[PDB]
C-alpha cells in the first residue's frame, strides 16, 4: 500500500476540525481513499485500500489537504481534486525586496488592499486564489495564471500604487 503524511500546525487545527466533513467525504466517495486524523502526531494520514483506482489521485488528494493546510478554502482545494493541471507556488515578500518592519506591513496592506478588494480583483481576474500568510504568499492556479498574478503581486510590492496595478491587471488579462 501507499501512505502520505501531512503536518497540521497549531493554528490550523480548529479549521481542520470544523471543516472535516467536506475534507474526508470528497476523498472517500469519488476517490475511494482512506484518511484519518492522527491527533498524537498532529498529522493527516492518507492511505490507499482495495477500493482505489487511478493511482495519481492519491498524490492529487495529498495536495488537496496540503492546500487546506496552507490557508486556502475547501472549494479551491476541491478544485485541486477535480482539475488536472493546477499548481500552488509560494514566495516570501522579502524575496523580491528587502522590507523592514512597517514597510513590510504596508506591503502586505497594498497586496491585500482596502477591504480585501485589491487581492480579490487579481483572483477574480486571473482565475487564481491567493493566500497571504504572515509573510509568505501562496498562489493557486494554472501556470500562466500564476505568472500573471505573481507579476501583479510583485508590482504591488514594487512600490507601485494599487490603482495603476488594478487598471493594468484588468487590461492584461485580455490576452
Amino acid at each position: 500500500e501507499e501512505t502520505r503524511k501531512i503536518p497540521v500546525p497549531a493554528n490550523r487545527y480548529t479549521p481542520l476540525k470544523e471543516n472535516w466533513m467536506k475534507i474526508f467525504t470528497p476523498i472517500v466517495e469519488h476517490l475511494g481513499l482512506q484518511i484519518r486524523f492522527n491527533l498524537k502526531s498532529r498529522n493527516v494520514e492518507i492511505r490507499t485500500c482495495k477500493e482505489t483506482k487511478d493511482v495519481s489521485a492519491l498524490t492529487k488528494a495529498a495536495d488537496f489537504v496540503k492546500a487546506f493546510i496552507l490557508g486556502f478554502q475547501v472549494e479551491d482545494a476541491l478544485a485541486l481534486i477535480r482539475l488536472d493541471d493546477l499548481f500552488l507556488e509560494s514566495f516570501e515578500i522579502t524575496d523580491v525586496k528587502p522590507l523592514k518592519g512597517d514597510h513590510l506591513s504596508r506591503a502586505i496592506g497594498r497586496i491585500a488592499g482596502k477591504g480585501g478588494k485589491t487581492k480579490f480583483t487579481i483572483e477574480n481576474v486571473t482565475r487564481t486564489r491567493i493566500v497571504l500568510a504572515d509573510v509568505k504568499v501562496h498562489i493557486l492556479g494554472s501556470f500562466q495564471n500564476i505568472k500573471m498574478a505573481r507579476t501583479a503581486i510583485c508590482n504591488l510590492i514594487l512600490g507601485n500604487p494599487p490603482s495603476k496595478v488594478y487598471g493594468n491587471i484588468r487590461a492584461v488579462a485580455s490576452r
Binding site: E75, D76, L78, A79, R82, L83, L86, R127, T128, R129, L140, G141, S142
Partner: peptide, 25 residues
C-alpha cells in the same frame, strides 16, 4: 470555487433568449 470559474470561463453560455417575431371559421 476555482474549478467552477475555470470551467465557466472556458464554456459558452446557453439557453435564455426570447424573440417576439412574426382557424375554424
Amino acid at each position: 470555487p476555482l474549478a467552477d470559474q475555470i470551467l465557466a470561463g472556458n464554456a459558452v453560455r446557453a439557453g435564455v433568449r426570447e424573440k417576439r417575431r412574426g382557424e375554424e371559421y
